[PDB]
């Protein structure tokens, strides 16, 4: 009774990391075999539990959080990490139990002309709480003068684009990431 990760993540486009997607997948076993329909190899690891304990264990709910980030940012998707992805886009709790899956998606998510669709948050007044999502687009006030909704000196639009191109080095190529949380 395998969770159909290969079906739900067979998608033309993934969520941007600031707008990370959550899917609830119910009454299923979370199994790595199905990922190979997604990609020929992947990062797959778990915090607080070994992947082996998932064998034959059906969960009442599996919450799968998905998004695209640079390859060299996959390291920020872990408890206790710091940086603009962990702090301002997608935050795991210090005591997180669950799993992280990532695969290179350069062939789907990069474009010779630049894929501007994938955005990330670069500026925020405070860090996200664990599993918080911020999709606001207020101008970020970096000084004491009000921005009045216009970017400019000390006034930043808060998101930036990854502009993925297939000739980027692997570290700046897009990776599809899926984070699993479990409810027995």
């Amino acid at each position, epitope marked *: 009774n395998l969770c159909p990760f290969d079906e739900v993540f067979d998608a033309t486009r993934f969520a*941007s990391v600031y*707008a990370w997607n959550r899917k609830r997948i119910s009454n299923c076993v979370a199994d790595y075999s199905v990922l190979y329909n997604l990609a020929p190899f992947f990062t797959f690891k778990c915090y607080g539990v070994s992947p082996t304990k998932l064998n034959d264990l059906s969960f009442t709910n599996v919450y799968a959080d998905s998004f695209v980030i640079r390859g060299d940012e996959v390291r920020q998707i872990a408890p206790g990490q710091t940086g603009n992805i962990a702090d301002y886009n997608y935050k795991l709790p210090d005591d997180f139990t669950g799993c992280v899956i990532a695969w290179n998606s350069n062939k789907l998510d990069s474009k*010779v*002309s*630049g894929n*501007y*669709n994938y*955005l990330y948050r670069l500026f925020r007044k405070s860090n996200l709480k664990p599993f918080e999502r911020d*999709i606001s*687009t207020e101008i970020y006030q970096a000084g004491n003068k009000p921005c009045n909704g216009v970017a400019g000196f000390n006034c930043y*639009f808060p*998101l*930036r*684009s990854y*502009s993925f191109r297939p000739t980027y080095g692997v570290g700046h190529q897009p990776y599809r990431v899926v984070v699993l949380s479990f409810e027995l």
Partner: nanobody
Amino acid sequence: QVQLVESGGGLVRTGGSLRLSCAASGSILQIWAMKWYRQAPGLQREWIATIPNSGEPFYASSVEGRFTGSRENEETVYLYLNNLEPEDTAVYYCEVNEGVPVREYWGQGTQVTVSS
């Protein structure tokens, strides 16, 4: 209500020059990039330049060195066409990538005709 309008196409002699322009309007939150494409008679649409809002322009090898992109402000870019050849005859199209979430916007294009 984001829209764009392309202008500056025309008829020129071989070796001639034009300045294409693409101007975005409407309720704009953030422009990410403008892209130029062209479609020649009987051929597939061809990407030729990207003029990002952040970052320097980059180009297809078919035009690089000869066509120059310029960002004049967040809403307005030019594509300077120099050293024009008959095989540059095409309809030229601007695509704007704008907004959160990112959306793509197109126009009707501008005709360039290069006579020999």
